[model samples]
Target: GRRRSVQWCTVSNPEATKCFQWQRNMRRVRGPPVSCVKRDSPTQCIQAIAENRADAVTLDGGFIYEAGLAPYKLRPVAAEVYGTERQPRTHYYAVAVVKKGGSFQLNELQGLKSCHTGLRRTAGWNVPIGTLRPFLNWTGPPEPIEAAVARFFSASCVPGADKGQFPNLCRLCAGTGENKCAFSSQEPYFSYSGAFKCLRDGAGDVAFIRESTVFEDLSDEAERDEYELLCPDNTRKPVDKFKDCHLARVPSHAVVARSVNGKEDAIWNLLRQAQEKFGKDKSPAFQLFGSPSGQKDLLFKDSAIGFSRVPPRIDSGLYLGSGYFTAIQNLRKSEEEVAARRARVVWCAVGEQELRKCNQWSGLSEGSVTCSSASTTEDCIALVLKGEADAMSLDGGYVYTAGKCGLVPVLAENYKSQQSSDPDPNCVDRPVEGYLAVAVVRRSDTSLTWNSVKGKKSCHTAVDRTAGWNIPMGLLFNQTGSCKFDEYFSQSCAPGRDPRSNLCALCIGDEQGENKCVPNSNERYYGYTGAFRCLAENAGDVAFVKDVTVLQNTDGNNNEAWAKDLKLADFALLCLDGKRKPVTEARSCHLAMAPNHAVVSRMDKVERLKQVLLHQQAKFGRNGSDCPDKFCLFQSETKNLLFNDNTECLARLHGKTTYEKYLGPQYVAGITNLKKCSTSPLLEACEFLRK
Candidate 1:
């Protein structure tokens, strides 16, 4: 029913010839069929793939960025792998290579002649320019970045640059007449080898290139010793130390195809068969990793050994990683726009309710705050890691996961203390006293106790939550010594689990009843209030939630119709001693003391996030001048939208700034033990990328 052949896009006649060779060889072996499509340039090939004229093409990191933009929206299906079979890598380091006899460090490179592989190439231009932006003294757009770069370096050879506008950029180029500074091999100093030769021939003082370029050109170690790498810390090291002394590590070239109906299976099948037959030294009739003499890097990198299938979830932004993605994005923005973005805080909300509240708060912040949202907490964390959103408040359990993914705590949500008299004037500086986690049940369930919770319908705020899951499930896991939580509770409403699983049987969707068992506000039995409502409505026998949840939702406290007539005396807390206690006696019958919810952000935005949050809360806070009359940040109609309703202030984290310290030793230890049962998929993904 579907096509089984792949149309391979080629940029040059030599590449088309190579593709034809691959097609004929694959036919001889009876492998997946391939057809070659020719294009004049990489961008043209990207356009061909987008229009369905071609099925796939391999491109460098810079061209991959272009291929993934607005009109194309292509996705990488496979990545090139380099190095030996025992230690292969899908990334390379961008390093600044200087002659060994130079007396200058990285910080003193102003007015020096430089050699670059080509304009907009990863190791050649993007990484080095972004790293040295602060010293360029060029205000962003309206005035192009190339103008500032031309002024920064007195003279340089940058292939594909506009030599007519900035003639200095082409001064060191070796090409004569019309061939000068061309993007193709016609220019004498165009690619990696050419750029290194520019530096070797004493025409340029430094070369911007990848770590492997030096070894590829200078086979003699004595000649290789003539080059050194400039470190970011104003120090210099031997060329072999590029791993520790490089501008950035960028993803390798990838084969990209159309995002919709790209024939991914056919393309991958063809590649696998071709690589198995002609890759590396597998055959002598044709070489997939080699080219004719005087030609280099045709179709794929000459050093590439094979290909690795990219995960389906990774798009171009994630494939390039956050640092590289942000750097390239910044290169396209104006200095004023970049500074404005850096000065503001973009809050990541989870679900519609939180987003509605955030939008309202944004309208009142005078452009200092903005809103971004995701369907779940893990998605919000991923957005923050990709720099699409700035910060979000996370539970202690999620804080540990975010911390593992390179986020730090900026502030904590402090609630009202038990003592009523003499309220603290400086709530922002006051220390936080965490709330209690309890096992809630209706007073009518007379036979149920802490010992009898097994084999009963249960309700949880969500999976991986501090009060709703970690505390209650941790204690049960320790006793049962089993990781099968779904089997432990006969049938329950645990959002984030598979919809068809028993764990999601009791979850009810929103008013339209569409998104059932989702881990956000779309599900009726999702959060603390939702879980407690499940027990009140007799949908479940027990609910694991915080103490404040019951008090704030019963006895006319909540205005919702389901909770309108609920009374405080109708609930009880299950204790460890097989006894039940009234809701007010939670201090003695609670499960554990969880860390307070805190705001988490990347290290680069921690200070700005803290400042903007503190300033915004002072206007919409509990005691602000325009609070109840205009808007309130801590009140959400008992829904706990965006923030907990009981939050008194956004207090500063005095010293416990890291995830382990903020969550405390005991709580972290408990979560670690519970994770042995089963880890989160998002957490596992983040951990793998972190390495």
Candidate 2:
């Protein structure tokens, strides 16, 4: 707190000193300094900008991607934000992080309706209002932030434990339970907001934070292996820095904005003039975006570098920081002081696919092999290109409008989940990227090998002559080139070679490449027609498609890539391939977990789970008497419609195929509304089912 203040600050820029020199001339906005306060972090800076504190700011493209914020609250204008190196654009993704053991669930989100206790309520409320709501829609706080948090929480969200983790649940204590201990089985007991302290104080079993937080602790020389990061979406995860450290919501800096858009055009001219005033020839010190979640003190104290952006990925990621990338550890000030004094920081390694765009060049900056050591944007770029960090995030527009390659937004919200009948560890919580990895194959190919077409004809969807003919044609003699299709059906994990397997998949045409349902199923083969149109042709066996909304077993052009059809397919779940894993072992669904439901003296709870699965599988077909009212031909109806008199039990099942499974088809009447028909059930059955 005793240090002198610099004119500006940014985290990723190794050249903060250089930028500082240039910004010396970075003067006032037309209406006073908007904030003569000089400001704190980007959040405050932005709050100032948002509240008319400043006119504008320059940061990595992450801000623009995420900053349509708070609905009618503030206006954001785009500019020529740039980076020294070229990498595919990246984003800030937050995680709804939880400790190894906690009450985190698949469908948690906050607004105001949440029931978390005290600080947990605060965290949940603030997270939804401050972060989530903005991303889902452009609307801002039409209501107060507190109101938003309250209303949102009340409506829908995965509830925290009424008590703690449940008994007999593998996930009760980190999902690593030993023995079949039901009675003494521990329930996850972290005290939401103060989970970290809970652990230190022995108050609970889990904590919810940001994913990056876990990564930070895991990566620390002294803290590695301390905990695990669990995504609420529900899939076991592998630990990596890409998912852990960098992509989080630390004390995130805010985006610079024009408090009033009326001044935008005028401010634009001024900023350009200011850039000229600060002239590029001087310090090579243009501002760089800061990590999304840096320390609060780091924001205000280190004026030599001011933040320009937030964490990289926003929407699909756990931005609320169930972990630590954006959010950080509450380490004591003394310990932190030592780390901050260093010019370098260690960054973590993300997936190759995530950083392929960032692989421009690395090793230019020496003495820092680790990622956190990076300071400048170029340094971050250097880290990525040198096989360190995935890729340095460049301004999206810069890639789109630059001389040769202006900035292009490689990531977008249009993405969809990958298709699979089986669980894919890789595709668990991660959004399906637009660039699909595709290939081609034939009916006879057992290993899903490729069959080249060469000069021969192929399925043509877009740009007729230049498409599908290539990859399928290549397999004939094994000629391949680099092409990043949004959805590619490939024979090998490592493309470009004639696959060892006898199968193939291919990308037929140019699709904007969003929501690619990567099919990593067990049946070993990949195939693609071209764009989505080719999939309409229904070539060999499996039609590998993208931007799919459904999976059709009968193979038709109209059958889009969807989970509904995909879940029924035989060869799903690539990870399970070659293993002796049973094809239908029953997964983590609530239906599979509720063993007690089978004992239902009242079947409401039990049947509801089954009904949900059926609803997902098939809408039970449109018409005809597959069976009336109580569906699931083989399933039992939840209602005891005739309990009081027990004169005649009448019910109808969906399909005739499983007819015998149900009690005799007396068919007097079936109660579609189980709750209303509850009174009909007898005294004994009431024991199993209650509100």
Candidate 3:
């Protein structure tokens, strides 16, 4: 059943009062029903929403991170879009502002009085404290971060910090009695404008605030020139240069709800209606982005223009992005924990076979390598995006998707290069020559050709795969000028689709026949080897695979029972000119030249992942120091587990680090064209957020 009303959570009395007015006005306008729930603080509101006592609450980035963690598992449904009509922004820059005449730079902020917006606030506390961590002399947990921050600053007004325990932290606060350094609006110096006031009144030497704070309060441009922004490079610049000279660019505050049964549609509907009727200057009787004369930023930021609905696939980690998410995580972790994470790489593996191989490799790496597993390649990519896993090797087709999701290629899986005259001794330095995507069929099936492949039963490695799906499907789509790929192939074994669909009709599961149509190696008709075997067994009329697959499996090359007696002469490549060529004629008769698979990870882990993988491969890779005797990373008997069995080495990108450069423009464009017909839910999610 659907929920009838949205319970809006408020942190303070004034905010609750605003919420009541909002509720009344919503009723007067006959919008979605509204109710108000009051809590003492943002955390309490988060707790109330999680417990289902309330339905939604707008939270700052730091609280959004906390809410998205265990027990709560909340997600942002709407973001408070700020700035003007011409230049609206859903993010802001966290900047360190100081008097322009100050002799000290960012690296020299020791023992100076500080004014923070509030404790744990994005611009005020998190970004500033995180930026100044190296100079604070804080040794990490068992000792609170606050004690170190307290000692570093001579005196401060950090709202929400306990004044009794750290009296100097609240010494400069202007609020009297119980209101001094309070977390709510009652505190005189509690938020962005208040913190700026603290610096203007000469109560503090510097104020940690958002880029717009100075301009918002000071009417005159000369008054804005009284302050400057401190950059991470230990230099200062004019306030307008915050784009280049800020601590961090933090996401805007968001309206969050539970991940499960959060009534997101109802909540979005309520907000959409309220903002239209009562948004900034829309209504004089009540305001959505306004507070009383004495109060500030009651329910939402006073500067907010409107709300932008967050994409459904954007969880906390994805919404915050790796840099900001890692920054927030680091603030809560000990130095040793942070160091340990940096020193090791967690490899993301797909399916049981890949996980088994990864665990074996982990055992040999002496703790430098670990394993995380998911059922499909896209799931593994999602794990990397969420920071739950560090790195993984991806097919060019998947690489494009991962790239759009903010991951970069660190290394390429260098295979046996053609014209093996003098193989490079340094495999890591060798440039990758891509593989050929080929359409294969039995030589006996003389009627089938590239032109007549449509309406035939087909075998594909998996959906969104370079050789198997993208290249072949892209060509067919261009020829037919239609996107109905399922209809083009009468019945096909394309893994990662609905089991009951024609796309999965030809897929045969494992020996026991249980995991049919699954995207991983668990299905017998899954990857290059599996797809080729599908054609050999006469299950499909044609197979979309790479040139190497046929060569690897035919003429008794593969000892597997299904492919043991298969002969190379029995197979033929379907050429575009409506003719068949011998299996070895892929150079002139292939569908497309596809990029090699590459390893991918977040920007922060690129160097560490590169160093660790290069070192690990030296010990266990093909031709490795301990190969055969101990364990081989590129082998899993006849199965190509973890990495391709034919992999020579994980080669350098040679400056082609980004996915766009590594995959090349032609291949990317082909995949992009294919995606116009259909896209994975994850890819769509990533594309929406990328904009």
Candidate 4:
């Protein structure tokens, strides 16, 4: 009989035979089912070790810090892309499911039930459900996790299964033949040479579930399931409908122990030797966790090595928390502190650049890590939930609402702020994030300089409930108290990229990947509060943005902080439809022909636009056609406009005057319009209230 001291269990997708194969290769000296158990729960698998019930387990690379696994110092020492020790991605899965024939967007998922899990907690899962659902709900929902599907020929889902393949096979059962909304029929054959296999034959849409519980034993071959996906925003082209959104798929496996007889050091050595041999294969060795101390009975059906029981408020909570995290951490800490133990922990991660670094919230040491590879944030969540890592780093936004499933930020890079000019190093704790991540606004009814549409009901975006329209709202609201801000908007562009004047394009794609703020996409509106697109998108009927070349005396090479500051304030990230008015004499495109990457003021800007994009393709962007200067090109029929030149040029076209004549509550129309995030913000009086 094997001693229970740091006992071992393998948590992997029980439905997957490969999971078993890998576990056998990694098991330490074992005797009975108690000593060496087979299960699928990353969290519990590691929990055995975390609580000293087990030592270590094999898991994927992405979940290490993402799921808050490292908060307790448990690290993932290996990574593998399908067991290959390459820097390639370690994948995980989460199924997006819905009844067939529903024309639902992602948001509708809030009302659906998940079909990805089995009653028995087994093989690891993917990203914390709390994060995936709410984040996608901002725009819509998370449907259709990606799977290894080669082809799909799904028909309307009624009686949707024709599951004739893989008879006697043990797998997940998506639906019963009795339900018309089922998916099946396509036969999937594995090509040994390929990295993945799609078992959908040719009948149904396919997706990756938390475990390999799909396509197991069933009398009716016609029963099946189908699903859609929620995907990354801004990166891929907007899809008419989302599909195949799974970002990770942490595999369940174990690392071997080195014990020959009774020597703990021997167990350590053998595992190390194996790592020296198989580490080249990018392998890990571990099993799933059991259950939380309290919920063990009710939560687990047969094995504690399966699904996750992360905390509530995980989606909205600002920290990372989950039972799996506790277990995994306990398991690894023992191995690391013990001088004669060999524990191999693996991790995984996922996400875009900004969304990806959320793991830093753990407040841990990043410089001391010696993991095999870092997985994406999505993958990390899957690994942790399955007891793969002791604790994993992850997006706290996810833990906000999912019970206690959360991340504990790594403090090294957590909130960075620039110091003052006088240079007090401790001046502030502010972080200059990519784009002031949020904007706050309040509603108002009184018509003012900042007020465009009075009596309009406005609400912020779900993503940024309090600070959705930050800078734009600030400029509009703040200006009402100071007439100078309102006066500034009426001003035209100075000659060139002069910071002192308005209307110069600056670069914006400067941080990491494709876009920056100093000179990339922001070049057009770099010098001012907004660009032609900004004005076009937000220009109240009273004000507009025109190309600088339209000015009587204008140049495109001005260097002014005012211009750069504007880009920082608002213009750097706006995606405008510049083609709005290609022929406005009052506002032509302000483009630089030399640097095609640069934004332009007129046809003369072609050169500058070309110059910026000479060597970079991502920076290349289209130019605006035309815009207005808050006034008609010629004198207006209702002319009463005044200028600092002491000239009257249809001054009624001004913003203040419009409020006087049209927006008076005494002139109230009694009609209320509800405001939403996508609402035309420039015409909103709600933002102008405080200004």
Per-residue alpha-carbon lDDT of model 4 for 356-445, expressed as tens digits? 222231112122211222222333433343333323222111222111222221111112122233322321132222112211111121
The global C-alpha lDDT for each of the candidates, from Candidate 1 onward, is 0.88, 0.27, 0.88, 0.26
Give a tens-digit lDDT track for model 3, residues 486-520. Answer: 89888989999899999999998988998999999
Q: Return the lDDT, model 1, position 193.
A: 82
Per model, state how many residue pairs clash: 0, 133, 0, 215
Candidate 4 CA-lDDT value: 0.26
lDDT of 1 by residue, 1-691 (tens): 2356799899888888888988898888788888899986788999999998889999888888899999999999898988789989888889999888878988888999999999989999999999888899987778889999999999999998999998989999988898899877778788788898899999999999989989988889999998899999999999988889999988888999987888888878878888898888988888888887777788888878998877665678767777888888999887788889898889999998899999999999999899999999989988888889999888887999999888999999998977853556888988988999999998988999999999999999998998889999899998979988888899899888889998899999898987888999889999899999989999899999999999999989997899999999999999988999999999999998988999999999988888888888888998877899999999988788888899999998889989988998888888888887777766665554564
Query: What are the runs in model 2 whose C-alpha is more than 4 Å off?
Result: 1-68, 72-318, 321-452, 455-611, 615-691
Q: How many clashes show up in model 3? A: 0
Best by TM-score: 3
RMSD to true structure for each model, in Å: 3.0, 25.5, 1.9, 25.8
Worst 10-residue lDDT window, candidate 1? 682-691
Q: Determine which window of 10 residues in candidate 3 has minimal summed lDDT.
A: 419-428
TM-score of each: 0.91, 0.25, 0.96, 0.25
Candidate 1 vs 3: which has more TM-score: 3
